[PDB]
Amino acid sequence: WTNTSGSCKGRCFELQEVGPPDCRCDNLCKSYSSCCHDFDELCLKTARGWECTKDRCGEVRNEENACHCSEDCLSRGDCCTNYQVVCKGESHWVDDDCEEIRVPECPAGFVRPPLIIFSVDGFRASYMKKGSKVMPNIEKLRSCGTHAPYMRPVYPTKTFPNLYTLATGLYPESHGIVGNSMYDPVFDATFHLRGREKFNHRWWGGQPLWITATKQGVRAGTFFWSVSIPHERRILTILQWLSLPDNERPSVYAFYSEQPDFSGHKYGPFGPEMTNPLREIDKTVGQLMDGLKQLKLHRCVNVIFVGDHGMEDVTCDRTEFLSNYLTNVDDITLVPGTLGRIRPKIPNNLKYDPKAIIANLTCKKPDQHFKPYMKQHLPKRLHYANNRRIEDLHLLVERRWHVARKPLCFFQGDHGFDNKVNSMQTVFVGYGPTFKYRTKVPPFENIELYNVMCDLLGLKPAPNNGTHGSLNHLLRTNTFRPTLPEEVSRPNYPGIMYLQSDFDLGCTCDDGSTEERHLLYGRPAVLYRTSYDILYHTDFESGYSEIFLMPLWTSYTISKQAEVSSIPEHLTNCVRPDVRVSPGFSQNCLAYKNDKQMSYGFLFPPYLSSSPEAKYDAFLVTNMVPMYPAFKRVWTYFQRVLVKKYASERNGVNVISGPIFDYNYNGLRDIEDEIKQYVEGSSIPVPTHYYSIITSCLDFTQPADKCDGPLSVSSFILPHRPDNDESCNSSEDESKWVEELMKMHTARVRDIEHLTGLDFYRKTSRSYSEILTLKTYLHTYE
Ligand SMILES: *[C@@H]1O[C@H](CO)[C@@H](O[C@@H]2O[C@H](CO)[C@@H](O[C@@H]3O[C@H](CO[C@H]4O[C@H](CO)[C@@H](O)[C@H](O[C@H]5O[C@H](CO)[C@@H](O)[C@H](O)[C@@H]5O[C@H]5O[C@H](CO)[C@@H](O)[C@H](O)[C@@H]5O)[C@@H]4O)[C@@H](O)[C@H](O)[C@@H]3O)[C@H](O)[C@H]2NC(C)=O)[C@H](O)[C@H]1NC(C)=O
Ligand SMILES: CC/C=C\C/C=C\C/C=C/CCCCCCCC(=O)OC[C@@H](O)COP(=O)(O)O
Ligand SMILES: *[C@@H]1O[C@H](CO)[C@@H](O[C@@H]2O[C@H](CO)[C@@H](O)[C@H](O)[C@H]2NC(C)=O)[C@H](O)[C@H]1NC(C)=O
Ligand SMILES: *[C@@H]1O[C@H](CO)[C@@H](O[C@@H]2O[C@H](CO)[C@@H](O)[C@H](O)[C@H]2NC(C)=O)[C@H](O)[C@H]1NC(C)=O
Ligand SMILES: [Ca+2]
Ligand SMILES: [K+]
Ligand code: NA
Ligand SMILES: [Zn+2]
Ligand SMILES: [Zn+2]
């Protein structure tokens, strides 16, 4: 019980936490039914609006006014933000020339630059192109500070998952807010945007920035604002807190605006109607910046202007209905819209038939505007599977479309789609002493920001999914010095030890300076305890695992001019024992011969051997990996057509390929116990995915093998599946569908590192920070 009888006299938006029985005067109160009886009256004044007019200057203070223009307002910290411009002849901040801020210029008593996070909902990256004509304050922040052309949100590209990702540095599958709506089968409870259940702390994982700050003795303003509190009041409140005594004043602040999202939904992202809400947000940024200038803080504070996701054109007319595919949709619950998650309407309903459902949803219309996935099959770059609140059955929906359960307008915009979709990209600008001046940075992912916000506040981040140091290039100071992970397992370098006669595998073949040409960036370090051998070859090098019986990685270089050659018919089924590696640590062809479903492929492609002699090396048993015929369609096209195409296009490429095991879909390297499938009758483990990392010189005029400067990388994590049901056009020639599949499964090098326990690019001429940026890069193909 809370005693509402008390008063918010001299308590408005107090920062001190107040529990029952006493009543509150903070943001969470209206929201919690714990406000004092005079909260609305004392704390939410509106009288006379938000701006000083000439006729108010010098006024005697009336405590009923929303803000003040009286002579004492400044030391009281409650002037309207435009007070000085109107009453003291000062200029608006936006009208002042841009000037580099080389060090914080802070008033007496400020020990470090405060951080203000100004978050905007549904701010599409491309809105920035409207420029100073529509958004002059934001344009000044953008042009004079540090900006990315866009920032990538997490999937699903909706508000709750993204704002909490900004706050924690975690993927939704790890922080737990996997949607705006979710069902937790263990709680047997439902979380909704609307309603009180979301207030229960059990839903919220990881450690958000405000808790991290507080635990390290750094004070935070509110990161929650009640919907009933107008934006102008939010800004005045922040400015009031910044005027507090040294021993009360917070170091970190957040502002949130539900615009331009609301208007985007109503009018669509390209509507002329979007101009007004954008002007309104800019006006709010102006109030903040004018207010800061009034406090002599405009060259002291670091300001982050950041969005949660973008906005796409989505209308009533573009809705797929599940009732068109399934006979009884009244028996399922669908989280609908720009994504789909399906579960039985009755929890744990035994008649739920997910295999039959997926079958009826797979490639059933030519123009089908979604694709069903079991969550383990979703592209790994989405990191969207390892949480009990994520339904097994997912629908990835095509941009511009909705999926709904059945047919049983007022919106023209929506978002939630695959986070590499252009329309979903959002904004990032950093301005202040700690950010660089007039600097553009490449796009980056929102998971990276928590680390940077900790850097800006002198905090040590809780464990998270950012790669700390990968954004050092945004900062003038406060950068994080990363340290190389130490290698855990040193390799063996086995020389010859066996004779062909020593081998009984069922295999038949009916007929320096390797490290220099083929390992351009050093050997990958193995960051777990295991046993493996380096193997050298004219055309390739590998780290062969004696445990998993195949390479952990195979590395090779292909020159721009490289020749593509066939596999001679007499070598079609050629597999050769490797006299460097014991028969007991080798695969055997017998298992393949006997397994009616599983075939094999090679990591280094015989198609790219330098000579007919060299080709024989590609047929070694130590280059062989288990591949379903379905996967082989993809892999052969990749080995035979695409790698060469890349070399020709990029002036040579260096390729590192290998297996990934992630049977429990947690995005991390499986241990032996977690592997669940082997080649028939054998102990040869079956990868869930195969990766390839393709590196070249960013300066394409230089060959990959003689690159003096920054690198260019594209990588993939291809799902190893027994069919190509994912690819609706796979009945056609590989040239009509394989690249499309690969693009969907693009990946960061960092993603591969998590999944493999390997550490790449340890011997380069670049800084460690640059390499970390490279490893976080995602080639999106948009
Ligand atoms: C992205 O970055 C994160 C953070 O580093 C990595 O996630 C971590 O993975 C490790 C290794 O697998 C896990 O270690 C295990 O820890 C558990 C005990 O964990 C409990 O206590 C910790 C510390 O207080 C807490 O963070 C954990 O929180 C999980 O569980 C909460 C309660 O149910 C839940 O509210 C929260 O959202 C989180 O759930 C997520 O993780 C669990 C696995 O723990 C998973 O089942 C769930 O679906 C969510 O994904 C928890 O209370 C020990 O018993 C083990 O021995 C082991 O040491 C970390 O717990 C885990 N941390 C978090 C916060 O998720 C990701 O691997 C990384 N991803 C990638 C791809 O790199
Ligand atoms: C570093 C932190 C980044 C920003 C600070 C702001 C919040 C940090 C908070 C994380 C928890 C946030 C919980 C949500 C508060 C806003 C709820 C909201 O107002 O939803 C608006 C609604 O349109 C979203 O629906 P939609 O995704 O647009 O379909
Ligand atoms: C709820 O709050 C009201 C207001 O503070 C409390 O009223 C006071 O109670 C004390 C204790 O007997 C009296 O001495 C005061 O005269 C009251 N003050 C006013 C201004 O009303 C009330 O006691 C609270 N209810 C509780 C404590 O259960
Ligand atoms: C999958 O789709 C088929 C139709 O293509 C559904 O089968 C129909 O539904 C009922 C019950 O099975 C039959 O009486 C109809 O004759 C079938 N229609 C056709 C056109 O053959 C099947 O029910 C669907 N499965 C699911 C799980 O929804
Ligand atoms: Ca795993
Ligand atoms: K076979
Ligand atoms: Na198919
Ligand atoms: Zn949003
Ligand atoms: Zn929205």
| One domain, residues 375 and 455 | yes
C-alpha span between 112 and 118 (Å, rounded): 19
What separation in Å is there between the alpha carbon of 122 and the centre of ligand 8? 5
Q: Which residue has the tokens 């492609």?
A: 605
| Nearest partner of 300 among 139, 432, 108, judged by Cα | 432
Handedness of CA 403, 407, 408, 410 (dihedral sign): positive
Q: Which residue has the tokens 């690019």?
A: 761
Structure tokens, 291: 């207010």
| One domain, residues 666 and 688 | yes
| One domain, residues 84 and 99 | no
Start-to-end CA distance of the chain, whole Å, equals: 55
Structure tokens, 573: 């089924």
Q: In this structure, how many other beta carbons lie within 10 angstroms of the beta carbon of residue 569?
A: 9
What separation in Å is there between the alpha carbon of 261 and the centre of ligand 9? 5
Identify the residue whose C-alpha is closest to ligand 1 atom 31: 205
- Mutating to test ligand 1, I would choose from 173, 174, 673 the residue with most ligand atoms within 8 A of its C-beta, which is 174
Does 82 show up as a binding residue in the annotation? Answer: no
How many domains does the chain contain in total? 4
Range of the domain at 25: 1-44
Does 668 show up as a binding residue in the annotation? Answer: yes
What separation in Å is there between the alpha carbon of 90 and the centre of ligand 1? 52
Whether 356 is in the pocket of ligand 4, judged by its Cβ within 6 Å, is yes
C-alpha span between 417 and 311 (Å, rounded): 10
Amino acid letter, residue 523: R
Q: Which residue has the tokens 């056609």?
A: 732
| One domain, residues 95 and 180 | yes
| One domain, residues 110 and 74 | no
Q: Characterise 665 by phi-psi region: left (phi > 0), alpha (psi -120 to 50), beta (else).
A: left
Asked if 431 and 146 count as a contact pair (C-beta separation under 8 A), the reply is yes
Q: Domain end: 430, 456, 480, which one?
A: 480
Structure tokens, 267: 């009018």
CATH number of the domain that residue 439 is part of: 3.40.720.10
Which residues lie across from 260 on neighbouring strands? 121
CA dist list (Å): 159 to 77, 163, 177, 180? 33, 6, 10, 7
326 Cα nearest atom in ligand 4? 28
C-alpha span between 455 and 133 (Å, rounded): 34
Which residues lie across from 713 on neighbouring strands? 695
Asked if 459 and 212 count as a contact pair (C-beta separation under 8 A), the reply is yes
3-state SS assignment for residue 746: strand
Identify the residue whose C-alpha is closest to ligand 3 atom 5: 6
CA dist list (Å): 735 to 457, 565, 636, 715, 730? 51, 18, 11, 19, 10
| One domain, residues 27 and 57 | no
Q: Domain end: 90, 125, 157, which one?
A: 90
| Nearest partner of 237 among 405, 78, 36, judged by Cα | 78
C-alpha span between 299 and 132 (Å, rounded): 21
Handedness of CA 673, 679, 685, 686 (dihedral sign): negative
What separation in Å is there between the alpha carbon of 479 and the centre of ligand 2? 28
- Mutating to test ligand 4, I would choose from 322, 323, 327 the residue with most ligand atoms within 8 A of its C-beta, which is 327
What string of DSSP letters covers 642-655?
A: IHHHHHHHHTSEEE
The DSSP bridge pattern shows strands 302-307 and 370-374 to be unpaired
C-alpha span between 235 and 240 (Å, rounded): 9
| One domain, residues 475 and 485 | no
How many residues does the structure list for the chain? 782
Identify the residue whose C-alpha is closest to ligand 3 atom 3: 5
353 Cα nearest atom in ligand 4? 27
Does 455 show up as a binding residue in the annotation? Answer: no
C-alpha span between 279 and 7 (Å, rounded): 37
Q: What is the 3-state secondary structure (H, E, C) of 468-513?
A: CCCCHHHECCCCCCCCCCCCCECCECCCCCCCHHHCCCCCCCCCCC
Which residues lie across from 4 on neighbouring strands? none
Whether residue 756 lies in the annotated active site: no
Q: What is the Cβ-side half-sphere exposure of residue 372, based on CA atoms within 13 angstroms?
A: 23
Q: Which own/partner contact pairs does 475-482 have at CB distance under 8 Å and 24+ positions apart?
A: 475/434, 475/435, 475/436, 476/102, 476/433, 476/434, 476/435, 476/436, 476/437, 477/433, 477/434, 478/434, 479/455, 479/769, 480/451, 480/455, 482/768, 482/769, 482/772
C-alpha span between 571 and 757 (Å, rounded): 35
| One domain, residues 443 and 298 | yes
Query: Over the range 211-235, which residues count as b (16 or more CB within 10 Å of their CB) and which as e?
Result: bbbeeeebbbbbbebbeebebbbbb
What separation in Å is there between the alpha carbon of 353 and the centre of ligand 4? 13
| One domain, residues 429 and 308 | yes
Helix (H) or strand (E) holding 771: helix 768-776
Whether 104 is in the pocket of ligand 3, judged by its Cβ within 6 Å, is no
Identify the residue whose C-alpha is closest to ligand 1 atom 50: 174
Whether 308 is in the pocket of ligand 2, judged by its Cβ within 6 Å, is no
With the CA atoms of 67, 73, 77 and 78 taken in that order, what torsion angle do they form, in degrees rounded to the nearest 10? 0
Asked if 13 and 43 count as a contact pair (C-beta separation under 8 A), the reply is yes
CA dist list (Å): 469 to 137, 216, 441, 459? 30, 21, 14, 14
Q: What is the Cβ-side half-sphere exposure of residue 740, based on CA atoms within 13 angstroms?
A: 12
Amino acid letter, residue 725: D
Q: Which residue has the tokens 């340290």?
A: 483
C-alpha span between 369 and 337 (Å, rounded): 12
CATH number of the domain that residue 519 is part of: 3.40.570.10
Helix (H) or strand (E) holding 694: strand 689-697
C-alpha span between 543 and 134 (Å, rounded): 56
Q: Residue 680 burial by CB count (10 A; 0-12/13-18/19+): exposed, middle or buried?
A: middle
Which distant-in-sequence residues (6+ apart) come within 8 Å of 519 by Cβ? 541, 555
Active-site position among 159, 165, 168, 237 = 159
Q: Which own/partner contact pairs does 671-678 have at CB distance under 8 Å and 24+ positions apart?
A: 672/547
Resolution for this model in angstroms, one decimal place? 1.7
Which residues lie across from 151 on neighbouring strands? 426, 444
Q: Characterise 432 by phi-psi region: left (phi > 0), alpha (psi -120 to 50), beta (else).
A: left
**Backbone phi and psi for residue 509, each to the nearest 5 degrees, phi listed first:** -125, 110
Whether 756 is in the pocket of ligand 1, judged by its Cβ within 6 Å, is no
C-alpha span between 576 and 618 (Å, rounded): 9
Q: At what angle do helices 275-294 and 231-242 cross, to 10 degrees?
A: 20
Q: Characterise 647 by phi-psi region: left (phi > 0), alpha (psi -120 to 50), beta (else).
A: alpha
The DSSP bridge pattern shows strands 146-147 and 439-440 to be parallel
- Method used experimentally: X-ray
Whether 730 is in the pocket of ligand 1, judged by its Cβ within 6 Å, is no
Q: In the chain, after which residues is the C-to-N distance over 2.5 Å, breaking the chain?
A: 408, 511
What separation in Å is there between the alpha carbon of 160 and the centre of ligand 2? 5
Does 38 show up as a binding residue in the annotation? Answer: no
Whether 205 is in the pocket of ligand 1, judged by its Cβ within 6 Å, is yes
Rg (CA), the chain: 30
- Smallest-distance ligand from the CA of 737: 7
**Backbone phi and psi for residue 659, each to the nearest 5 degrees, phi listed first:** -90, 155
Check residue 154 and report its DSSP letter: P
**Backbone phi and psi for residue 524, each to the nearest 5 degrees, phi listed first:** -65, 140
The DSSP bridge pattern shows strands 402-404 and 319-321 to be parallel
Whether 257 is in the pocket of ligand 1, judged by its Cβ within 6 Å, is no
Asked if 736 and 727 count as a contact pair (C-beta separation under 8 A), the reply is no
176 Cα nearest atom in ligand 1? 37
| One domain, residues 20 and 107 | no
Check residue 432 and report its DSSP letter: S
Q: In this structure, how many other beta carbons lie within 10 angstroms of the beta carbon of residue 28?
A: 16
Structure tokens, 284: 């709010």
CATH number of the domain that residue 80 is part of: 4.10.410.20
C-alpha span between 658 and 677 (Å, rounded): 17
Amino acid letter, residue 13: F
Amino acid letter, residue 392: D
What separation in Å is there between the alpha carbon of 379 and the centre of ligand 2? 26
Which distant-in-sequence residues (6+ apart) come within 8 Å of 133 by Cβ? none
- Which segments of 433-510 does DSSP mark as H helices, in order? 449-457
Angle (CA) 737 738 743, round 5°: 100
| One domain, residues 49 and 179 | no
Identify the residue whose C-alpha is closest to ligand 1 atom 23: 206
Structure tokens, 376: 């383990």
| One domain, residues 510 and 378 | no
Does 666 show up as a binding residue in the annotation? Answer: yes
C-alpha span between 601 and 761 (Å, rounded): 26
Asked if 43 and 14 count as a contact pair (C-beta separation under 8 A), the reply is no
Structure tokens, 730: 């796979």
Which residues lie across from 429 on neighbouring strands? 147, 305
3-state SS assignment for residue 218: coil
Whether 500 is in the pocket of ligand 3, judged by its Cβ within 6 Å, is no
Q: Domain end: 455, 480, 505, which one?
A: 480
Which residues lie across from 666 on neighbouring strands? none
Identify the residue whose C-alpha is closest to ligand 4 atom 23: 327
3-state SS assignment for residue 234: helix
Amino acid letter, residue 299: R
C-alpha span between 671 and 113 (Å, rounded): 45
The DSSP bridge pattern shows strands 746-747 and 711-719 to be antiparallel
Asked if 256 and 225 count as a contact pair (C-beta separation under 8 A), the reply is yes
Asked if 614 and 637 count as a contact pair (C-beta separation under 8 A), the reply is no
Check residue 4 and report its DSSP letter: T
Whether 258 is in the pocket of ligand 2, judged by its Cβ within 6 Å, is yes
Q: Which residue has the tokens 């990161």?
A: 223
| Nearest partner of 659 among 630, 640, 682, 631, judged by Cα | 631
